[PDB]
Amino acid sequence: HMINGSIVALITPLNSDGTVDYTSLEKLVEYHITEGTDAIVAVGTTGESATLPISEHIAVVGQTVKFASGRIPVIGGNGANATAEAIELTKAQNKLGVAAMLGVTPYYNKPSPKGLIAHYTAVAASTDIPQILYNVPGRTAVDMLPETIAQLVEVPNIIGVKDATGDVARVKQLRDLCGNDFLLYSGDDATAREFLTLGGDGVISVANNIVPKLFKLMCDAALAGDTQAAMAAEDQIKGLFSALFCEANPIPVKWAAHKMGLISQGDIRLPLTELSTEFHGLLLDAMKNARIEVK
């Protein structure tokens, strides 16, 4: 495909009663279009997939598409830890208008490598939308290694992989086993720029939510081989790459977005909780240092 560069793993904004705040979601979409983000992932981990039941999950993906109105690709979150639940989310998104789907490996139940292969083959067989694989063993408790991802490159609608391990040596291992056309996205903001420098195609990012302009600049420059401009853009925002993780994503990034006036309400669904006050100064400082206005 040609989906690449700076991709935002969008937060799902909520109202005071915990229902989805569609007005803010629309404003987030316009914001990304204006700021130059390359694509939007709806209902990934950053979008709190776990606490959206299926009907709400697909309503969010569907409305995100509708707000985009052809101006930016939207990629639908479709991972599950039951192969059948993943097919069901896929099928429900077939008619949506989504450029692609992003599916985390099964979490918590720890499938073997052949189970991962069979899981994603079954999900790919249920659609012709492109599928992007997503490895994050720090949350799922399985590390889907390059020699497993490799056995899936042959599926014609499996087009790429979001790897969040921060292990940048995996770019070369993945390039050698998957070819030049398999799309490689960093899911780890802190190593993102290096990950592009070594050969990656793009970044599906948290920090994106709040610094989309500089992040886009960082990414373009790194893809273009202009490393000084890439490091110079990274420099400004780098503190966010730890501060947005003082408590689990998206607890911090949701706080930042509310604090900035991007979304009406800071509400987040249990078992996640609002950023605790002991980290508020830490984050506010990192936001100032990233040139984010207010307060």
Binding site for Na ion (CB under 5 A): 153, 158
**Closest separation between CB of residue 177 and ligand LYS, Å?**
29
122 is a site residue for a second copy (CB under 8 A): yes
Tokens of 63: 């409305």
Instruction: Quote the Cα angle for 239-241-243, to 5°.
Output: 65
118 is a site residue for a second copy (CB under 8 A): yes
> Cα separation of 107 and 144, whole Å?
11
**Closest separation between CB of residue 263 and a second copy, Å?**
19
> Cα separation of 185 and 196, whole Å?
8
Site string for a second copy, 202-241 (x = CB under 8 A): ----------------------------------------
* Catalytic-labelled residue, pool 31, 107, 120, 134: 134
Given ligand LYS, a second copy, Na ion, none, residue 116, with its beta carbon under 5 to 8 Å by kind, binds: a second copy
- The stretch among 25-33, 65-73, 106-114, 231-239 that binds a second copy (CB under 8 A) is 106-114
107 an active-site residue?
A: no
- Residues 6+ away with beta carbon under 8 Å from 45: 9, 77, 104, 136, 139, 249, 250
83 is a site residue for a second copy (CB under 8 A): yes
185 an active-site residue?
A: no
Given a second copy, ligand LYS, Na ion, none, residue 54, with its beta carbon under 5 to 8 Å by kind, binds: ligand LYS
Given Na ion, a second copy, ligand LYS, none, residue 251, with its beta carbon under 5 to 8 Å by kind, binds: a second copy
Given a second copy, ligand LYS, Na ion, none, residue 158, with its beta carbon under 5 to 8 Å by kind, binds: Na ion
Residue 251, marked binder: no
List the binding residues for pyruvate.
46, 204
Q: Which residues are catalytic?
A: 134, 162
Site residues (vs a second copy, CB under 8 A): 45, 48, 50-51, 53, 81-85, 104, 106-112, 114-116, 118-119, 122, 138-141, 247-248, 251, 269-273, 276
List the binding residues.
46, 204
